[PDB]
Design a protein around this nucleic acid. Structure first.
Ligand SMILES: Nc1ccn([C@@H]2CS[C@H](COP(=O)(O)OP(=O)(O)OP(=O)(O)O)O2)c(=O)n1
Ligand SMILES: *P(=O)(O)OC[C@@H]1O[C@H](n2ccc(N)nc2=O)CS1
Ligand SMILES: [Cl-]
Ligand code: NA
Ligand code: NA
Ligand code: NA
Ligand code: NA
Ligand code: NA
Ligand code: NA
Length: 292
DNA sequence: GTCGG
DNA sequence: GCTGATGCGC
DNA sequence: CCGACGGCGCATCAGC
């Protein structure tokens, strides 16, 4: 948190590059600079000090210098105040609204959530769901709720066919105290690298018990949607949550599990998601999810 | 925007 | 209607 | 100096 001013500034610039400029490589450059500075154990005093870090070059060093002198960046102040650029950047916070859709909406005078609400006919299915749960989607999920969600998923999965194997992956599997979403990996002995309706049946059951509430996409191997825990008589509704379910062939299942458990950095220096009869087999060259 | 061949 | 391209999320 | 900078499932578009 020592350089939060700088990292905040670089993330804001990254967002403008991705959402407004449509310059994905600059978005990534700014994000990489932000992340190396975030983990730097000193409070940065000059652009020159920052440049020493991989991913910080001449232009970001110059911006760091301006920020340290003035607590702001003229360029960033100007883009913030720009009605068009700030509106485009904002609308991409809606799931399903990317840089192209945001630009098209803003060019039509649709600039706010309110405007989106009045214009349901101009939104596709995903965007309508993104708008409906805009606030809920930006919330994190407490571990306590993830456990309750896990409970429902594993119960209903076994109920459909006791031969399914399902594992909730992500930071949750590593024992984290909160998650952004629920990631479920599903397999079945019948499904292998060369092999009916295995995903649909699970999705249908989870809908039957009113756990899955909406669908963003559903193909033969991947479901993306929305779920919600049940409430009671006089306790406030749980937020709606993002849930993904991936059907993976049995012989590739445990590579997927390794992958989708992470962490990202752990995967990187353990280094694909596809190609084994357990997590231990791959470890070869064993660490449990807690210490990954 | 940064890096490196 | 078909097929390959594009947008999007992650 | 100048090209690399990620891959893939699904929804939907754009070109015939
Ligand atoms: N951007 C990323 C993030 C994760 N990973 C890999 C594959 S999924 C595995 C575990 O991801 P985590 O759940 O720790 O990261 P998330 O960003 O989903 O944290 P949550 O907000 O907890 O959900 O790490 C990646 O390759 N690229
Ligand atoms: P989500 O943020 O839940 O991430 C989980 C998995 O990580 C992989 N991933 C994340 C981000 C990006 N940009 N690319 C990517 O492959 C797949 S989903
Ligand atoms: Cl770019
Ligand atoms: Na551009
Ligand atoms: Na550097
Ligand atoms: Na979006
Ligand atoms: Na977004
Ligand atoms: Na996640
Ligand atoms: Na597909």
């Amino acid at each position: 948190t020592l350089n939060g001013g700088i990292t905040d500034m670089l993330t804001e610039l990254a967002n403008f590059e991705k959402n407004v400029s449509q310059a994905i490589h600059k978005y990534n450059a700014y994000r990489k600079a932000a992340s190396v500075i975030a983990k730097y154990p000193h409070k940065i005093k000059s652009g020159a000090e920052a440049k020493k870090l991989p991913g910080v070059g001449t232009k970001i060093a110059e911006k760091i210098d301006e920020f340290l002198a003035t607590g702001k960046l003229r360029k960033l102040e100007k883009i913030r105040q720009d009605d068009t650029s700030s509106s485009i950047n904002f609308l991409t916070r809606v799931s399903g609204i990317g840089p192209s859709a945001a630009r098209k909406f803003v060019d039509e005078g649709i600039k706010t959530l309110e405007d989106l609400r009045k214009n349901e006919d101009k939104l596709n299915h995903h965007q309508r769901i993104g708008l409906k749960y805009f606030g809920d989607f930006e919330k994190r999920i407490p571990r306590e709720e993830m456990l309750q969600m896990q409970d429902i998923v594993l119960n209903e999965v076994k109920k459909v066919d006791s031969e399914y194997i399902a594992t909730v992956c992500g930071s949750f599997r590593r024992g984290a105290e909160s998650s952004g979403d629920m990631d479920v990996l599903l397999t079945h002995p019948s499904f292998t690298s060369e092999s009916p309706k295995l995903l649909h049946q699970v999705v249908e059951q989870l809908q039957k018990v009113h756990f899955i509430t909406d669908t963003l996409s559903k193909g033969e191997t991947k479901f993306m949607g929305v779920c919600q825990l049940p409430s009671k008589n006089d306790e406030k509704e749980y937020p709606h949550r993002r849930i993904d379910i991936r059907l993976i062939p049995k012989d590739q299942y445990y590579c997927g599990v390794l992958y989708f458990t992470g962490s990202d950095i752990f995967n990187k220096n353990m280094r694909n998601e596809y190609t084994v009869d357990s997590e231990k087999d791959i470890f070869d060259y064993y660490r449990e999810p807690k210490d990954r």
